[PDB]
Amino acid sequence: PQVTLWQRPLVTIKIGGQLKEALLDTGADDTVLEEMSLPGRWKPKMIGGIGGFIKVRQYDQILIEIAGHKAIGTVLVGPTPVNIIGRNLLTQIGATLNF
Amino acid sequence: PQVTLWQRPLVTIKIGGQLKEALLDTGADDTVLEEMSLPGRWKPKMIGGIGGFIKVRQYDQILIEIAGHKAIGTVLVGPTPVNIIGRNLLTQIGATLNF
Ligand SMILES: COc1ccc(S(=O)(=O)N(CC(C)C)C[C@@H](O)[C@H](Cc2ccccc2)NC(=O)O[C@H]2[C@H]3CO[C@H]4OC[C@@H]2[C@H]4C3)cc1
């Protein structure tokens, strides 16, 4: 689908058996989700945004469905104020920007 | 132009007579630029991102050229780590997202 930007580009995602809403975010290199339960082993990592930094947990090779499209990749979990789908997953579902 | 997302979607902007690079950011409601000199009166405002909050200066009806396209709108200036073009300006240049 094509989406204009008069509203936030929110989509439905499915990850770890659960349904959530997330923001398609061309401004984000990586994917960052609010606190949630994931299966498996993770790695401690710190990332930075507009107001400073947060500690996240890094999960690799995680299956995630984004607006119907399946992708496997790294997902960071930590105290972000919103679920963000970043470029590491956007390239996998073939998202482009038109200006 | 259409742009894929294997790299950051950076474009050239011109604002207040100066040339800068900025990120086309569908995840940002508003436009936030690093500290720079602008002409005119502004308003004190605070905005929030992944690691917390920052104080910005809000400039209205500012002329800004984004990748060749002229737009007039609100620009926030403050200690963001990167120049961000948000949805308030992206709609004006007709940017869309395709997934
Ligand atoms: C390497 O991996 C990553 C992944 C993500 C991030 S990030 O989240 O910091 N970011 C990067 C951006 C260059 C600042 C993406 C934006 O799209 C955020 C995403 C985000 C949205 C909402 C809340 C928190 C984060 N936009 C936002 O800060 O905008 C505010 C300010 C700009 O306009 C408005 O829209 C959202 C708020 C608000 C004021 C950093 C590193």
Is A25 designated active site? yes
Residue ranges of alpha helices (H) inside A1-99 are 87-90
Residue B50 Cα, ligand 1 centroid: separation in angstroms?
6
> For residues A25-38, b (16+ Cβ closer than 10 Å) or e, as one string?
bbbbebbbbeeeeb
Of all atoms in ligand 1, which is nearest to the CA of residue B27?
Answer: 17
Residue A42 Cα, ligand 1 centroid: separation in angstroms?
23
Task: Kindly give the pairing relationship between strand B52-66 and strand B69-77.
Answer: antiparallel
Distance CA A98, CA A1 (A): 13
Domain boundaries, chain A: 1-99
Task: Please give the CATH architecture assigned to the domain spanning A1-99.
Answer: Beta Barrel (2.40)
Residues in chain A with CB shorter than 8 Å from the CB of B81 are: 48-50
B94/A94 CB distance under 8 A: no
Reduced to 3 states (helix: H, G, I; strand: E, B; else coil), residue B15 is strand
Helix (H), strand (E) at residue A13:
strand A10-15
Residues forming a β-bridge with A21: A12
